[PDB]
C-alpha cells in the first residue's frame, strides 16, 4: 500500500504537476481513505521526496555497479547511468528539480548525491592522470563539478523538451564528446 501511493503519484505526475495533485487524488489512486494515506506519509511533498530518493539511489547503485567491474566508452557507460535512470523516470525528475526551490529536504538530497558523483568523477580523472592517460590541466574537482552540472542541466532540458535543448536522441553523444575532450585535451 506504500508502493501503491508511490506508483499512483508517479502516474499522476506524468499528466500534471504536484500543485495540481491532492492527497485525496493519491488516496483514491492507491484505493485507501485520505486518513489512511497519512499513516504512510505526512504530505504529498514527502511522497515526491521518497520517489526522488529511490530514483537517485537507483542511479547511485548503478554507478557503483560500474565502479566495481576504451576511455570514450568508460565515460559513455557512466553518463548512460544518468541518461537511462532519469530518462525512465522523467515526471519524478521534472517534479524533483522543481521542488528544489520549495523543499529543503529535496535540495539537500540532490546536493548530497551531486557532491558524491562529482567526488567520483574527480577520483576517476585523478586516476587517469596518475597513470599518464590524462594531462594535469584544471583542478580535477573543479572540472568534475562543471561537467556534472552540465549533465544535470542538459539531460533535464532534453527530458522536458525545453527550448533550447539537445534532442534526446543526440544528448548522450553530445555530453560524451565534451567530457572526453575536456578530460584528455590540452
Residues that bind a second copy (CB under 8 A): 98, 101, 111, 114-115, 118, 137-139, 142-143, 145-150, 152-154, 157, 162-167, 170-171, 173-175, 177-178, 181-182, 184-186
Nearest CA to 82 out of 105, 124, 116 is that of 116
Is residue 37 a contact residue for ligand GJE (CB under 6 A)? no
Q: What is the CA radius of gyration of the chain?
A: 19
Per the listing, cell 535540495 goes with 107
The span from the CA of 9 to the CA of 3, in Å, is: 10
| Binders of ligand GJE in range 105-134 (CB under 6 A) | 117, 120-121, 124
* DSSP structural state of residue 132: T
Q: Pick one of ligand GJE, a second copy, none as the site partner of residue 32 (Cβ within 5 to 8 A by kind).
A: none
Is residue 97 a contact residue for ligand GJE (CB under 6 A)? no
Q: Pick one of a second copy, ligand GJE, none as the site partner of residue 127 (Cβ within 5 to 8 A by kind).
A: none
Q: Pick one of ligand GJE, a second copy, none as the site partner of residue 142 (Cβ within 5 to 8 A by kind).
A: a second copy
Q: Which residues of 100-118 are buried (b: 16+ CB within 10 A; e: fewer)?
A: eeebeebeebbeebbeebb
The span from the CA of 60 to the CA of 56, in Å, is: 6
Residues that bind ligand GJE (CB under 6 A): 74-75, 78-79, 82, 117, 120-121, 124, 148, 151-152, 155
Amino acid at each position: 500500500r506504500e508502493l501503491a501511493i508511490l506508483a499512483t503519484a508517479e502516474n499522476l505526475l506524468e499528466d500534471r504537476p504536484l500543485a495540481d495533485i491532492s492527497v485525496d487524488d493519491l488516496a483514491k489512486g492507491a484505493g485507501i481513505s485520505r486518513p489512511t494515506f497519512y499513516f504512510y506519509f505526512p504530505s504529498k511533498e514527502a511522497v515526491l521526496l521518497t520517489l526522488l530518493d529511490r530514483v537517485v539511489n537507483q542511479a547511485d547503485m548503478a554507478l557503483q555497479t560500474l565502479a566495481e567491474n576504451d576511455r570514450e566508452n568508460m565515460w559513455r557507460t557512466g553518463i548512460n547511468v544518468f541518461f537511462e535512470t532519469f530518462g525512465s523516470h522523467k515526471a519524478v525528475t521534472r517534479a524533483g528539480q522543481a521542488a528544489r526551490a520549495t523543499s529543503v529536504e529535496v535540495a539537500e538530497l540532490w546536493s548530497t548525491f551531486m557532491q558524491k558523483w562529482i567526488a567520483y568523477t574527480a577520483a576517476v580523472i585523478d586516476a587517469e592522470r596518475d597513470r599518464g592517460a590524462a594531462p594535469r590541466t584544471l583542478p580535477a574537482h573543479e572540472l568534475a563539478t562543471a561537467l556534472n552540472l552540465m549533465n544535470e542541466r542538459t539531460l533535464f532540458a532534453s527530458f522536458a523538451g525545453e527550448q533550447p535543448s539537445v534532442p534526446e536522441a543526440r544528448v548522450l553523444d553530445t555530453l560524451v564528446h565534451i567530457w572526453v575532450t575536456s578530460i584528455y585535451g590540452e
